Amino acid sequence: VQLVQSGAEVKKPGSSVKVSCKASGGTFNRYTVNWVRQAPGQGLEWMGGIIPIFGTANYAQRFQGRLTITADESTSTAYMELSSLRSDDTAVYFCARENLDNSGTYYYFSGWFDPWGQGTLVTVSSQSALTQPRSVSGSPGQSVTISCTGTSSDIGGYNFVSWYQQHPGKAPKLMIYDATKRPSGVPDRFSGSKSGNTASLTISGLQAEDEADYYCCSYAGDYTPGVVFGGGTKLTVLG
Amino acid sequence: EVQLVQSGAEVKKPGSSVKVSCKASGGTFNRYTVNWVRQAPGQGLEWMGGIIPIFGTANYAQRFQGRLTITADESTSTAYMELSSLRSDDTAVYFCARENLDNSGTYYYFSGWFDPWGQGTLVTVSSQSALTQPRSVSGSPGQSVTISCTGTSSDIGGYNFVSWYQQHPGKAPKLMIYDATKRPSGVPDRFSGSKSGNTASLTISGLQAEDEADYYCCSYAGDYTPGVVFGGGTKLTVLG
């Protein structure tokens, strides 16, 4: 049985969000669905669960009033709804199943969690990071293009755009400045372009060393000078 | 060339403050600005603020105003960042980054790009969980390690429903022990669990490099409080 969750989410504080958890195994009534969230660099926290057979759902004391968990047996999918979002709600949300054959029909939500979903990232922030694809994959020798788009406000001609490459455990390193210009040492396999609301980074002749996270960056261009980064794009090179 | 070196990692409680430093080995500090960018584990970059050492002026992003101040000492070419009223939401790696400065006399303009960067400083803000585990344990290959988990008489002390979970970076938790002592299929016999009073224990014999991960204990939270509680987690390092 495989548990598949809905894609990542970017919400503003005060709104709500729906996360789905669809199961690949049949006999939907046999299992219970739990939701466990994990903040970045934090531990696991139980939020609530649902039992399709009883139509019952329980929630933790801090989420009562802001959380509701549903399930539809026709699609074998479970849902969670968190309302009145705030910054401390930024976490990866996991769905986990409990088999009632082995664990019995009484001691449900007891911690026998198996299997798990892949997790769903939900980011809540008053400041809105520029929109990038979450991940891009390529083969060596091929080319990939990574876009960067304004989210709450548009990117324009007055915006200074830069691109940064970051390897695991290392500081970011400047790839592209002034939208299209390469700094000292950077090979011409990396190129940038900007048109209206969109900026793009192109990596041609992909090499294994290019596997990293890539961040666009915008400076100035508005009435309050500042710096805003993109959400990041994970680039995988399939050797 | 000029290398930016930052202070070491810190572990703080919520409600306190933290100061990270950023020393420049060479170059003149007066011809650059120093920015601070933070990065939560597994998350993107976030600009916090910058300082112009000559002007003695610092600008901060909106959400940090009232909690963040950035200072500098031109004598040691060191920039400082202080974040106050810490919350668990502030757990992140903190980078310092240098920005080029130029002027025409009275008007000073910035380059818009950051280079070079400091190595980054980790700051962990964690509170106490319902179950208490050691923050981290370290062992050598072949040795044994034991991770304890303490609760109250209404969870570990009143029920047998204690479970243990292993989590590798970027992956979902994986069940290693359930019902205090039972191993699920596909879990090696090196992992074992026990329970005594209000304390549960996970033991790993014949430690292997792949055992390096995060481990969480989990317990039924009593009949009057449906659901489960989790421990804060234990980072297990295998020193090869």
Rounded Cα gap, residues A79 and A71, in angstroms: 6
Identify the structural domains of chain B with CATH numbers, from first to last. 4-125 (2.60.40.10), 136-235 (2.60.40.10)
Is residue B66 a contact partner of residue B48, using CB atoms and an 8 Å limit? no
How far from A213 is each of A30, A120, A137, B70, B79, CA to CA, in Å? 41, 19, 12, 28, 27
Is residue A143 a contact partner of residue A202, using CB atoms and an 8 Å limit? yes
CB distance A226–B118 less than 8 Å? no
Nearest to A21 by CA among A89, A94, A115: A94
Interface membership of A10 toward B (CB under 8 Å): no
Minimal-distance CA residue of chain B relative to A119: B172
Rounded Cα gap, residues A22 and A2, in angstroms: 8
HSE-up (13 A, CA, CB side) for residue B239: 8
Token readout for B4 is 């930016």
Helix, coil or strand: residue B90 = helix
For residue B58, list chain A residues with Cβ-Cβ distance below 8 A: none
Nearest to B120 by CA among B185, B191, B40, B60: B40
Mutation target to probe the B interface, by most B beta carbons within 10 A, among A42, A184, A186, A219 is A42
Token readout for A235 is 């680039």
Q: Report the run of H or E that residue A199 belongs to, with start and end.
A: strand A198-203
C-alpha A30: how far from its chain's center? 30
Token readout for A85 is 């979002």
What letter represents residue B72's amino acid? Answer: A
The count of other CB atoms within 10 Å of the CB of residue B220 is: 25
Q: Which residues of B42-65 are buried (b: 16+ CB within 10 A; e: fewer)?
A: ebbbbbbbbbbbbeeebbbbeebe
Which residues make beta-bridge pairs with A104?
none
Minimal-distance CA residue of chain A relative to B182: A112
CA distance A232 to chain B (A): 6
Please give the method by which this entry was determined.
X-ray
HSE-up (13 A, CA, CB side) for residue A201: 31
DSSP state of A153: S
CB distance B91–A219 less than 8 Å? no
Nearest to B147 by CA among B159, B157, B158, B136: B136
Cα dihedral sign, B187-B188-B190-B194: positive
For chain B, how big is the Rg over CA atoms in Å? 23
Per DSSP bridges, beta strands A233-237 and A135-138 are parallel
Interface membership of A174 toward B (CB under 8 Å): yes
- Counting other chains too, the contacts that B78-81 makes at CB distance below 8 Å and 24 or more residues apart are B78/B21, B78/B22, B78/B23, B78/B24, B79/B21, B79/B22, B79/B29, B79/B34, B79/B51, B79/B53, B80/B19, B80/B20, B80/B21, B80/B22, B81/B19, B81/B20, B81/B21, B81/B22, B81/B36, B81/B48, B81/B49
Is residue B58 a contact partner of residue B48, using CB atoms and an 8 Å limit? no
Rounded Cα gap, residues A47 and A80, in angstroms: 10
Rounded Cα gap, residues A146 and A159, in angstroms: 18
How far from A151 is each of A218, A232, A238, CA to CA, in Å? 12, 14, 30
Nearest to A93 by CA among A2, A26, A23, A17: A17
Interface membership of A190 toward B (CB under 8 Å): no
Is residue A36 a contact partner of residue A96, using CB atoms and an 8 Å limit? yes
CA distance B22 to chain A (A): 14
CA distance A54 to chain B (A): 15
Q: Strands, DSSP E only, in B40-180?
A: 45-52, 57-60, 68-73, 78-83, 92-103, 108-117, 121-125, 136-139, 145-150, 162-167, 174-177
Which residues make beta-bridge pairs with A130?
A230
For residue A48, list chain B residues with Cβ-Cβ distance below 8 A: 227
Helices (H) and strands (E) in chain B, counts: 0, 20
DSSP state of A102: H
Token readout for B86 is 């810490």
CB distance B91–A40 less than 8 Å? yes
Resolution (A): 2.4
Strands lying side by side in the sheet with A44-51: A9-11, A120-124, A91-99, A31-38, A44-51, A56-59
Interface membership of A192 toward B (CB under 8 Å): no
Nearest to B77 by CA among B101, B98, B104: B98
Annotate A28-97 with three-state secondary structure: HHHEEEEEEEECCCCCEEEEEEEECCCCEEEECCCCCCCEEEEEECCCCEEEEEECCCCHHHCEEEEEEE
